[PDB]
């Protein structure tokens, strides 16, 4: 029994080698992230409006996904912009000053 | 015993398969660099224009996006709109 | 025997790395698309920023128009929609009634 | 070969015309915003208040033909008929 | 194949022409709206009571609409003006003072 | 090809139709200016009176409109009145 | 039992060392780039991750979304 | 008393089990200590790494729960659709 | 019988101090390392454990996730 | 009779516990375990808090215990 | 019940002495070392419960 488990541990030795390969994968991905961070963070350090626009785009993309989703979605009616009589109505233009 | 040796050999071959996965990951790193450049260039163009223009563009994009989202989610019986600060009700 | 099938799986993994090379080219195409859209947005931003920075209020009218378009959209939707009765402007006697005229002055 | 030449022309034309459509619509919104801003800057928001009132009338009309729309009095609990 | 794609791109050229006409639509609306802005803002600068009165009429118009609607409506009992003992009863006259 | 030719011609005709939409929009601009004049003349008369008289009518008209609205909504079983700030279960 | 425990102790320790190398080398790289540049990458990754998560959960009939603040009664 | 005799034997077996547990426990702690030095020094310069890790963790969790049999009630601020509230700018505001 | 109970208590004391010795050795290694370093390891392990826990509970039909506070509902 | 027993118990326990009442804390932990074994076979319907499961690693209370040790 | 209660008094004093000796040992060790053991024990008991 124990010797069979020791051979399983020999398999685990190859799984340690597998973990080393996984480590190289992880480092490669991290290198990609570091280079991306320099390039992108430089641009966004001047003005992050890109992120804002990207967030808007994300909303649209998400709406296309969930439009065909099996999920049950309860969602605020404020997204319908129908309440013209509230205080939030002007906030956007108020932000523009 | 034989099955443990067999699984051991499988793990050895899987370590080399992980090498192939790493090759995929390095090609993915190249693709990720390309997409990162795209995001950086787009952010640069947009940041330079908005630094002097303001957020007016963003406000208009939000309004038309609200229209687009309402349209996109119109053909969906699984979506229910509830008012801010509601209570309890099923139907 | 079984590990020659493992080798065939490794050949497929090499082909998947080649498909990742394809994805590198695909990413080049996507980068160009993002750049084109960004140029459009930058030009739009300059033109809109001037006019809206002079006086926001085109935003308010566009938001009113957006509310109307959305009402037309949801009027024929499959969604269950719970709105607030304040949209009906029927409660003439409360502190929100004068709010608009107060904003004017 | 032929499809690659087709793709080059197609993709360039597609991106070009998409950008030009965006340019035209942005110019239209900019000129509209200019016309509106220059007038409201001296007139005030009275126009917008009237637009909101008549828009409420229109919205109530548009949502009158739908059993999927329900109006609730700001703060309220649970019921259903 | 080659031409379905390229001729849909040419269709996009004509959609750009359509966008030119859509631009003019929006500009027409903006021109008329600017004229309205001038007239109305000047008239309402002396006193915005007109807004208040139109708001009242809006309520009446809306009540005509929803009275025949398929819409399910939960209103507040305060619209019935029946609680003569409420501390808000005098509010209107207090505003007149 | 053997649909796309027509489709681009359809978009061309849609541009021409949008030009006709502009024509009716020019007439809508005229009508909008007329109605704007109506609102500005009404607002001028009413503002000139109320600026010296006080709200006056606004309170009285709210009472009259409350009577009117209650009457108009009396013929409907889709409308119900809930107490202000207070919960109700269907009874 | 002890021999098996020791072989697994060796292999678990070596796997932990490999993981520590991988994580500390993923950091550094990322941490230095983010020491110079800002968190713009973080926010962009959040946005696209929101898109991806929405997609991954799009096929489940036991996942539901509720408005941020207020429980109701559902059907 | 036979059950009690067996129970005393089982207590002795648990003593030996505790010895094995101590060995395993110490070795795992040893690995964690080395990892703590290596990782903590890197994260002490900029913890943004774990921010990314957290994002990736979310994605992994998503893929797991997409197959899970659990009932999951999520908030609607996932699916960023409310472009009109204050959380829209919040992220870019913190970026600055 | 009672003698075996007392002997068991003695054996349990021995096992308890073996385990406690191991606990203190682990705590010593980790406490010294974390004192030199910081809690970055703690945060990383919490993320990994969150993934693991979500996985372990993924096959249960008795677990329901509720959205950060929230009060009462029933989905029919 | 019971009061006499309690008086003696109080003298001994009060002396020992005045130095460090942590004994009680340990005893309290044991009480939890004993109660668990009881209620595990109980006919009662028991609604507990999920915080007993320690699963929420992201909550601010997570560090609480170690923070007490600091 | 009174007969039982007299015997209970004896047993109660015995067990109270045991509790006080346990409290003495534990109080001394905790007074000088700290209450870290207790936090650890809380975690062990959470799993057991």
From Swiss-Prot, chains A, E:
Transmembrane segments: none annotated. It is found in: Mitochondrion inner membrane; Cytoplasm; Nucleus; Cell membrane. Residues 1-40 form a coiled coil. The modification N6-acetyllysine is found at residues 2, 38, 52, 64. Induction: Expression increases approximately 3-fold upon entry into G1 phase compared to other phases of the cell cycle. Also induced following inhibition of mitochondrial protein synthesis by thiamphenicol. It comes from the Eukaryota. Phosphorylated. Tyrosine phosphorylation is indirectly stimulated by IGFBP6. Expressed in myoblasts. The mitochondrial prohibitin complex consists of two subunits (PHB1 and PHB2), assembled into a membrane-associated ring-shaped supercomplex of approximately 1 mDa. Interacts with ESR1, HDAC1 and HDAC5. Interacts with ZNF703. Interacts with STOML2. Interacts with ARFGEF3. Interacts with SPHK2. Interacts with COX4I1; the interaction associates PHB2 with COX. Interacts with MAP1LC3B (membrane-bound form LC3-II); the interaction is direct and upon mitochondrial depolarization and proteasome-dependent outer membrane rupture. Interacts with IGFBP6 (via C-terminal domain). Interacts with CLPB. LC3-interaction region (LIR) is required for interaction with MAP1LC3B/LC3-II and for Parkin-mediated mitophagy. Protein with pleiotropic attributes mediated in a cell-compartment- and tissue-specific manner, which include the plasma membrane-associated cell signaling functions, mitochondrial chaperone, and transcriptional co-regulator of transcription factors and sex steroid hormones in the nucleus. Belongs to the prohibitin family. This is Prohibitin-2. It comes from Homo sapiens (Human). The lineage of its organism: Eukaryota, Metazoa, Chordata, Craniata, Vertebrata. The chain holds residues 199 to 295 of 299 of the full protein.
From Swiss-Prot, chain G:
The modification Phosphotyrosine is found at residue 55. It comes from the Eukaryota. The modification N6-succinyllysine is found at residue 8. The modification N6-acetyllysine is found at residue 8. It is found in: Mitochondrion inner membrane; Nucleus; Cytoplasm; Cell membrane. Widely expressed in different tissues. Induction: Expression increases approximately 3-fold upon entry into G1 phase compared with other phases of the cell cycle. Also induced following inhibition of mitochondrial protein synthesis by thiamphenicol. Belongs to the prohibitin family. Protein with pleiotropic attributes mediated in a cell-compartment- and tissue-specific manner, which include the plasma membrane-associated cell signaling functions, mitochondrial chaperone, and transcriptional co-regulator of transcription factors in the nucleus. Plays a role in adipose tissue and glucose homeostasis in a sex-specific manner. Contributes to pulmonary vascular remodeling by accelerating proliferation of pulmonary arterial smooth muscle cells. In the mitochondria, together with PHB2, forms large ring complexes (prohibitin complexes) in the inner mitochondrial membrane (IMM) and functions as a chaperone protein that stabilizes mitochondrial respiratory enzymes and maintains mitochondrial integrity in the IMM, which is required for mitochondrial morphogenesis, neuronal survival, and normal lifespan. The prohibitin complex, with DNAJC19, regulates cardiolipin remodeling and the protein turnover of OMA1 in a cardiolipin-binding manner. Regulates mitochondrial respiration activity playing a role in cellular aging. This is Prohibitin 1. The gene is PHB1. The chain holds residues 195 to 269 of 272 of the full protein.
From Swiss-Prot, chain H:
Protein with pleiotropic attributes mediated in a cell-compartment- and tissue-specific manner, which include the plasma membrane-associated cell signaling functions, mitochondrial chaperone, and transcriptional co-regulator of transcription factors and sex steroid hormones in the nucleus. The gene is PHB2. GO terms for cellular component: cell periphery; cell surface; cytoplasm; mitochondrial inner membrane; mitochondrial outer membrane; mitochondrial prohibitin complex; mitochondrion; nuclear matrix. Transmembrane segments: none annotated. Phosphorylated. Tyrosine phosphorylation is indirectly stimulated by IGFBP6. Keywords: Acetylation, Cell membrane, Coiled coil, Cytoplasm, Host-virus interaction, Membrane, Mitochondrion, Mitochondrion inner membrane, Nucleus, Phosphoprotein, Receptor, Repressor, Transcription, Transcription regulation. This is Prohibitin-2. It comes from Homo sapiens (Human). Belongs to the prohibitin family. Changing residue 26 to P: Reduces helicity. Decreases homodimerization and interaction with PHB. Disrupts mitochondrial dynamics. Disrupts mitochondrial-mediated antiviral innate immune response. Expressed in myoblasts. The lineage of its organism: Eukaryota, Metazoa, Chordata, Craniata, Vertebrata. The modification N6-acetyllysine is found at residues 1, 37, 51, 63. Induction: Expression increases approximately 3-fold upon entry into G1 phase compared to other phases of the cell cycle. Also induced following inhibition of mitochondrial protein synthesis by thiamphenicol. Residues 1-39 form a coiled coil. LC3-interaction region (LIR) is required for interaction with MAP1LC3B/LC3-II and for Parkin-mediated mitophagy. One of its GO terms (molecular function) is amide binding. It is found in: Mitochondrion inner membrane; Cytoplasm; Nucleus; Cell membrane. One of its GO terms (biological process) is positive regulation of DNA-binding transcription factor activity. Its main location: mitochondrion.
